[PDB]
Design a protein around this ligand. Structure first.
Ligand SMILES: *P([O])(=O)([O-])O[C]1O[C]([C]OP([O])([O])=O)[C]([O])[C]([O])[C]1[O]
Ligand SMILES: [Mg+2]
Length: 221
């Protein structure tokens, strides 16, 4: 009986979490911060551009100037934007296109709840824009992931209560944002990274409408 699905983008719809990681690691190393490895990057997944940069700068003893802070965020974004120019429909993760088609057939709303300002560009790259009933603008919320605001806004944008929605996420921060919104999270990734307390699937082929119904029917929510 859920009425909406609230999609993260990066690491859910396609493998762009890998590109954010590579770009943040390159930035960090340029400023002599070598701690952005895959384990540290689990604290960056789902986190805004500025919050990501500050989590990396927290690894250093000294502060950068406000001018350098702004430059660094822009530097990373310009690199990332170059990395994603060749993304195509062939890069949609397994299961995702068919899930979008099945949700529309079943009159279940589809909304994007990505913290990325590059979200709309990436949905166009992948020929997915037409499936979305709404895209929650991440610059409109007052509080970014792990705050629930973006999931609350995604649900509102398609006229469904968060409590009647499922959220799909690959990150610690986004799973917390889903929990605090009222929606039911189903994570994608390693249990070791995302927790043993919610439903986690190992890859996105598991994100079928059949499975979302299976999970919803057992407590949920
Ligand atoms: P999700 O994974 O919330 O689709 O995206 C998150 O977006 C932020 C901000 O991206 P931007 O605006 O393109 O710089 C990234 O820092 C996170 O890595 C990403 O998970
Ligand atoms: Mg993500």
């Amino acid at each position: 009986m859920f009425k909406a699905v609230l999609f993260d983008l990066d690491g859910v719809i396609t493998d762009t979490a890998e590109y954010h990681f590579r770009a943040w690691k390159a930035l960090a190393e340029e400023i002599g911060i070598n701690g952005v490895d895959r384990q540290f990057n689990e604290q960056l997944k789902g986190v805004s551009r500025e919050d990501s940069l500050q989590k990396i700068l927290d690894l250093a003893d000294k502060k950068v100037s406000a001018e350098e802070f702004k430059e660094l965020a822009k530097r990373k974004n310009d690199n990332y934007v170059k990395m994603i120019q060749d993304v195509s429909p062939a890069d949609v993760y397994p299961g995702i296109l068919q899930l979008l088609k099945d949700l529309r057939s079943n009159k279940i709303k589809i909304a994007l709840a990505s913290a990325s300002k590059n979200g709309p560009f990436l949905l166009e790259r992948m020929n997915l824009t037409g499936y979305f009933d709404a895209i929650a603008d991440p610059a409109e919320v007052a509080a970014s992931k792990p705050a629930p605001d973006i999931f609350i806004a995604a649900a509102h944008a398609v006229g469904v209560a968060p409590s009647e929605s499922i959220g799909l996420e690959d990150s610690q921060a986004g799973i917390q944002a889903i929990k605090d919104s009222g929606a039911l999270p189903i994570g994608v990734g390693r249990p070791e990274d995302l927790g043993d307390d919610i439903v986690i699937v190992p890859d996105t082929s598991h994100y079928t409408l059949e499975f979302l119904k299976e999970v919803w029917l057992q407590k949920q929510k």
